Amino acid sequence: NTVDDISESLRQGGGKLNFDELRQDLKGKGHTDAEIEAIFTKYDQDGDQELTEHEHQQMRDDLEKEREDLDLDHSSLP
Numbered sequence: 001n002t003v004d005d006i007s008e009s010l011r012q013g014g015g016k017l018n019f020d021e022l023r024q025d026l027k028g029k030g031h032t033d034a035e036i037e038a039i040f041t042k043y044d045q046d047g048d049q050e051l052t053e054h055e056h057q058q059m060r061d062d063l064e065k066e067r068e069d070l071d072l073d074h075s076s077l078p
Contacts, residue, residue: 001030009039010064013056019047
């Protein structure tokens with residue numbers, strides 16, 4: 001719960017997806033309001049329509065790649 005398995009948000013993308021489909025699911029995962037807001041907000045620019053494949057897959061790859069690089073520091077030093 002504390003670690004917040006974001007992998008759940010990334011898994012979603014079954015063509016038809018909107019702030020409700022993901023948020024309602026994430027709520028059960030014990031996710032935080034700030035995280036939930038940020039996650040949908042980033043993948044959903046105007047959160048008014050359904051998220052297609054290209055938009056959803058593009059960000060997903062970009063976010064996954066950033067999550068690793070962000071964690072995996074360049075070196076032990078600051």
